[PDB]
Ligand binder design. Structure first.
Ligand code: NAG
Lengths: 48, 34
């Protein structure tokens, strides 16, 4: 067991680690990235 | 009494959840994993 204490130096204090891992077995439309705003206007020739 | 759901006895590794005369029609299809 790691016996942690507050009076340790760096390199022995407890660090928390998380790792992400992707894999595309074959899905065609799974969770993708997100998006956001951009003020809507009307009665103007615009690129939409 | 009125007790039910004797369909299965195992539900492991669930990869999807969801909760929320007369003619009741359905069309089922399965294309590209959908
Ligand atoms: C599916 O469940 C079995 C145990 O029934 C387990 O060994 C396996 O790791 C599970 N698969 C995934 C992807 O979690």
């Amino acid at each position: 067991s790691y016996g942690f204490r507050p009076t340790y130096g760096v390199g022995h204090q407890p660090y928390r680690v998380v790792v992400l891992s992707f894999e595309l077995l074959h899905a065609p439309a799974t969770v993708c990235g997100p998006k956001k705003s951009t003020n809507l206007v009307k009665n103007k020739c615009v690129n939409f | 009494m009125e007790s039910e759901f004797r369909v299965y006895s195992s539900a492991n590794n669930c990869t999807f959840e969801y909760v929320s005369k007369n003619l009741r029609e359905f069309v089922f299809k399965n294309i590209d994993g959908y």
